[PDB]
């Protein structure tokens, strides 16, 4: 199963998401991340 990533509409960094989730909102921000260690725009983007 592929790794899904979502782009923060503010900082444009890509954040990994767990497999479970379609049904994302139209706009998405780091602050919405289920992973609490990647939940603001200051955290660097994880390497691919």
């Amino acid at each position: 199963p592929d790794q899904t990533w979502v782009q923060c509409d503010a900082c444009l960094k890509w954040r990994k998401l767990p497999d479970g989730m379609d049904q994302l909102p139209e706009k998405w921000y780091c602050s919405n991340n289920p992973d609490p260690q990647f939940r603001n725009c200051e955290v660097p983007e994880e390497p691919e």
Partner: peptide, 8 residues
């Protein structure tokens, strides 16, 4: 939201 997919 804008998404992408990469192979594991």
């Amino acid at each position: 939201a804008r998404t992408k997919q990469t192979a594991r």
